[PDB]
Backbone as XML, in Angstrom:
<?xml version="1.0"?>
<chain id="A" units="angstrom">
  <residue number="1" name="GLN">
    <atom name="N" x="-30.830" y="-1.601" z="-0.301"/>
    <atom name="CA" x="-29.427" y="-1.935" z="0.395"/>
    <atom name="C" x="-28.626" y="-2.316" z="1.460"/>
  </residue>
  <residue number="2" name="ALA">
    <atom name="N" x="-29.053" y="-3.925" z="0.165"/>
    <atom name="CA" x="-28.051" y="-5.342" z="0.704"/>
    <atom name="C" x="-26.571" y="-5.079" z="-0.290"/>
  </residue>
  <residue number="3" name="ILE">
    <atom name="N" x="-26.819" y="-4.498" z="-1.635"/>
    <atom name="CA" x="-26.449" y="-4.950" z="-2.905"/>
    <atom name="C" x="-24.783" y="-4.154" z="-2.420"/>
  </residue>
  <residue number="4" name="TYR">
    <atom name="N" x="-25.615" y="-3.015" z="-1.529"/>
    <atom name="CA" x="-24.535" y="-1.858" z="-0.785"/>
    <atom name="C" x="-23.783" y="-2.524" z="0.755"/>
  </residue>
  <residue number="5" name="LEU">
    <atom name="N" x="-24.321" y="-3.447" z="0.947"/>
    <atom name="CA" x="-23.709" y="-3.997" z="2.484"/>
    <atom name="C" x="-22.287" y="-5.081" z="1.299"/>
  </residue>
  <residue number="6" name="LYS">
    <atom name="N" x="-22.540" y="-5.705" z="0.300"/>
    <atom name="CA" x="-21.953" y="-6.943" z="-0.411"/>
    <atom name="C" x="-20.916" y="-5.946" z="-0.741"/>
  </residue>
  <residue number="7" name="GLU">
    <atom name="N" x="-21.230" y="-4.376" z="-1.355"/>
    <atom name="CA" x="-19.569" y="-4.079" z="-2.423"/>
    <atom name="C" x="-19.070" y="-3.629" z="-1.080"/>
  </residue>
  <residue number="8" name="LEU">
    <atom name="N" x="-19.481" y="-2.762" z="0.118"/>
    <atom name="CA" x="-18.725" y="-2.672" z="1.298"/>
    <atom name="C" x="-17.687" y="-4.159" z="2.028"/>
  </residue>
  <residue number="9" name="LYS">
    <atom name="N" x="-18.481" y="-5.109" z="1.883"/>
    <atom name="CA" x="-17.640" y="-5.975" z="1.863"/>
    <atom name="C" x="-16.449" y="-6.343" z="1.288"/>
  </residue>
  <residue number="10" name="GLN">
    <atom name="N" x="-17.029" y="-6.572" z="-0.450"/>
    <atom name="CA" x="-15.655" y="-7.081" z="-1.265"/>
    <atom name="C" x="-14.866" y="-6.040" z="-1.047"/>
  </residue>
  <residue number="11" name="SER">
    <atom name="N" x="-15.683" y="-4.827" z="-1.067"/>
    <atom name="CA" x="-14.294" y="-3.297" z="-0.181"/>
    <atom name="C" x="-13.017" y="-3.671" z="0.287"/>
  </residue>
  <residue number="12" name="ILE">
    <atom name="N" x="-13.909" y="-3.803" z="1.472"/>
    <atom name="CA" x="-12.960" y="-4.396" z="2.982"/>
    <atom name="C" x="-11.948" y="-5.239" z="3.044"/>
  </residue>
  <residue number="13" name="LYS">
    <atom name="N" x="-12.360" y="-7.004" z="1.855"/>
    <atom name="CA" x="-11.753" y="-7.529" z="1.588"/>
    <atom name="C" x="-10.452" y="-6.582" z="0.960"/>
  </residue>
  <residue number="14" name="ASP">
    <atom name="N" x="-10.400" y="-6.600" z="-0.169"/>
    <atom name="CA" x="-9.557" y="-6.414" z="-1.665"/>
    <atom name="C" x="-8.748" y="-5.640" z="-0.436"/>
  </residue>
  <residue number="15" name="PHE">
    <atom name="N" x="-9.312" y="-4.351" z="-0.522"/>
    <atom name="CA" x="-8.339" y="-2.867" z="1.052"/>
    <atom name="C" x="-7.458" y="-3.786" z="1.909"/>
  </residue>
  <residue number="16" name="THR">
    <atom name="N" x="-7.921" y="-5.022" z="2.623"/>
    <atom name="CA" x="-6.753" y="-6.124" z="3.077"/>
    <atom name="C" x="-5.289" y="-6.460" z="2.688"/>
  </residue>
  <residue number="17" name="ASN">
    <atom name="N" x="-5.971" y="-7.069" z="1.624"/>
    <atom name="CA" x="-4.112" y="-7.630" z="0.418"/>
    <atom name="C" x="-4.032" y="-6.327" z="0.353"/>
  </residue>
  <residue number="18" name="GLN">
    <atom name="N" x="-4.551" y="-5.291" z="-0.249"/>
    <atom name="CA" x="-3.562" y="-4.227" z="-0.849"/>
    <atom name="C" x="-2.599" y="-3.632" z="0.647"/>
  </residue>
  <residue number="19" name="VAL">
    <atom name="N" x="-3.082" y="-3.750" z="1.850"/>
    <atom name="CA" x="-2.385" y="-3.043" z="2.583"/>
    <atom name="C" x="-1.009" y="-4.211" z="3.180"/>
  </residue>
  <residue number="20" name="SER">
    <atom name="N" x="-1.762" y="-5.123" z="2.279"/>
    <atom name="CA" x="-0.517" y="-6.430" z="3.135"/>
    <atom name="C" x="0.448" y="-6.143" z="2.079"/>
  </residue>
  <residue number="21" name="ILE">
    <atom name="N" x="0.054" y="-6.053" z="0.079"/>
    <atom name="CA" x="1.217" y="-6.243" z="-0.850"/>
    <atom name="C" x="1.891" y="-3.819" z="0.145"/>
  </residue>
  <residue number="22" name="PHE">
    <atom name="N" x="1.439" y="-2.945" z="0.155"/>
    <atom name="CA" x="1.858" y="-1.919" z="0.461"/>
    <atom name="C" x="3.065" y="-2.790" z="1.607"/>
  </residue>
  <residue number="23" name="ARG">
    <atom name="N" x="2.688" y="-3.296" z="2.781"/>
    <atom name="CA" x="3.612" y="-3.284" z="4.226"/>
    <atom name="C" x="5.028" y="-5.023" z="3.255"/>
  </residue>
  <residue number="24" name="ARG">
    <atom name="N" x="4.740" y="-5.375" z="2.479"/>
    <atom name="CA" x="5.577" y="-6.320" z="1.880"/>
    <atom name="C" x="6.447" y="-5.260" z="0.808"/>
  </residue>
  <residue number="25" name="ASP">
    <atom name="N" x="5.877" y="-4.197" z="0.709"/>
    <atom name="CA" x="6.651" y="-3.562" z="-0.388"/>
    <atom name="C" x="7.849" y="-2.647" z="0.028"/>
  </residue>
  <residue number="26" name="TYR">
    <atom name="N" x="6.975" y="-2.159" z="1.528"/>
    <atom name="CA" x="8.280" y="-1.223" z="2.768"/>
    <atom name="C" x="9.606" y="-2.112" z="2.412"/>
  </residue>
  <residue number="27" name="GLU">
    <atom name="N" x="9.247" y="-3.092" z="2.986"/>
    <atom name="CA" x="10.176" y="-3.910" z="3.873"/>
    <atom name="C" x="11.468" y="-3.886" z="2.965"/>
  </residue>
  <residue number="28" name="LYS">
    <atom name="N" x="11.491" y="-3.791" z="1.786"/>
    <atom name="CA" x="12.432" y="-4.218" z="0.473"/>
    <atom name="C" x="13.211" y="-3.281" z="-0.389"/>
  </residue>
  <residue number="29" name="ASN">
    <atom name="N" x="12.119" y="-2.293" z="-0.628"/>
    <atom name="CA" x="11.537" y="-1.036" z="-1.345"/>
    <atom name="C" x="12.310" y="0.053" z="0.062"/>
  </residue>
  <residue number="30" name="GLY">
    <atom name="N" x="12.784" y="1.820" z="-1.171"/>
    <atom name="CA" x="12.710" y="2.792" z="-0.226"/>
    <atom name="C" x="13.748" y="2.727" z="0.972"/>
  </residue>
  <residue number="31" name="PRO">
    <atom name="N" x="12.908" y="3.944" z="2.206"/>
    <atom name="CA" x="13.635" y="4.167" z="2.922"/>
    <atom name="C" x="14.151" y="3.342" z="4.062"/>
  </residue>
  <residue number="32" name="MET">
    <atom name="N" x="14.143" y="1.742" z="3.648"/>
    <atom name="CA" x="14.401" y="1.209" z="4.523"/>
    <atom name="C" x="16.235" y="0.818" z="4.360"/>
  </residue>
  <residue number="33" name="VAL">
    <atom name="N" x="17.014" y="0.750" z="5.006"/>
    <atom name="CA" x="18.910" y="1.168" z="5.239"/>
    <atom name="C" x="19.518" y="-0.133" z="4.465"/>
  </residue>
  <residue number="34" name="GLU">
    <atom name="N" x="18.750" y="0.060" z="3.182"/>
    <atom name="CA" x="19.972" y="-1.126" z="2.384"/>
    <atom name="C" x="21.030" y="-0.680" z="1.562"/>
  </residue>
  <residue number="35" name="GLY">
    <atom name="N" x="20.690" y="0.947" z="0.871"/>
    <atom name="CA" x="21.672" y="0.946" z="-0.049"/>
    <atom name="C" x="22.441" y="2.218" z="0.152"/>
  </residue>
  <residue number="36" name="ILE">
    <atom name="N" x="23.035" y="2.809" z="-0.667"/>
    <atom name="CA" x="23.502" y="4.160" z="-0.212"/>
    <atom name="C" x="22.481" y="5.303" z="-0.661"/>
  </residue>
  <residue number="37" name="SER">
    <atom name="N" x="22.414" y="5.039" z="-2.148"/>
    <atom name="CA" x="21.227" y="5.678" z="-2.421"/>
    <atom name="C" x="21.329" y="7.542" z="-2.361"/>
  </residue>
  <residue number="38" name="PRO">
    <atom name="N" x="22.244" y="8.230" z="-3.163"/>
    <atom name="CA" x="23.026" y="9.283" z="-3.343"/>
    <atom name="C" x="21.767" y="10.639" z="-3.187"/>
  </residue>
  <residue number="39" name="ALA">
    <atom name="N" x="21.432" y="11.004" z="-2.760"/>
    <atom name="CA" x="20.059" y="11.912" z="-2.719"/>
    <atom name="C" x="19.288" y="11.549" z="-3.620"/>
  </residue>
  <residue number="40" name="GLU">
    <atom name="N" x="18.311" y="10.562" z="-4.155"/>
    <atom name="CA" x="17.536" y="10.525" z="-4.886"/>
    <atom name="C" x="16.540" y="9.840" z="-4.445"/>
  </residue>
  <residue number="41" name="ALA">
    <atom name="N" x="17.334" y="9.595" z="-3.015"/>
    <atom name="CA" x="15.690" y="9.250" z="-1.842"/>
    <atom name="C" x="14.311" y="9.958" z="-1.843"/>
  </residue>
  <residue number="42" name="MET">
    <atom name="N" x="14.159" y="10.562" z="-2.290"/>
    <atom name="CA" x="13.580" y="11.853" z="-2.108"/>
    <atom name="C" x="12.620" y="11.427" z="-3.128"/>
  </residue>
  <residue number="43" name="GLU">
    <atom name="N" x="12.666" y="10.843" z="-4.098"/>
    <atom name="CA" x="11.964" y="10.262" z="-5.659"/>
    <atom name="C" x="10.922" y="9.323" z="-5.250"/>
  </residue>
  <residue number="44" name="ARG">
    <atom name="N" x="11.893" y="7.881" z="-4.327"/>
    <atom name="CA" x="10.944" y="7.433" z="-3.979"/>
    <atom name="C" x="10.254" y="7.243" z="-2.700"/>
  </residue>
  <residue number="45" name="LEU">
    <atom name="N" x="10.818" y="8.177" z="-2.062"/>
    <atom name="CA" x="9.631" y="8.481" z="-1.085"/>
    <atom name="C" x="8.318" y="9.489" z="-0.550"/>
  </residue>
  <residue number="46" name="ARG">
    <atom name="N" x="8.765" y="10.876" z="-2.519"/>
    <atom name="CA" x="8.058" y="10.659" z="-1.954"/>
    <atom name="C" x="6.430" y="10.033" z="-3.446"/>
  </residue>
  <residue number="47" name="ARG">
    <atom name="N" x="6.466" y="9.141" z="-3.408"/>
    <atom name="CA" x="5.413" y="7.863" z="-4.059"/>
    <atom name="C" x="5.615" y="7.807" z="-3.352"/>
  </residue>
  <residue number="48" name="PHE">
    <atom name="N" x="6.182" y="7.017" z="-2.265"/>
    <atom name="CA" x="5.274" y="6.528" z="-1.574"/>
    <atom name="C" x="4.745" y="7.585" z="-0.385"/>
  </residue>
</chain>
């Protein structure tokens, strides 16, 4: 049961910085209002 607790630990630990790099990709990439991007935004929005 303990090693499963430590697995849950490392899981939460890595998921945190995953969400970090997630929110950090957001501001520079995609639906943020930066360029024209004529009607292509759907592809990147769907990958998001």
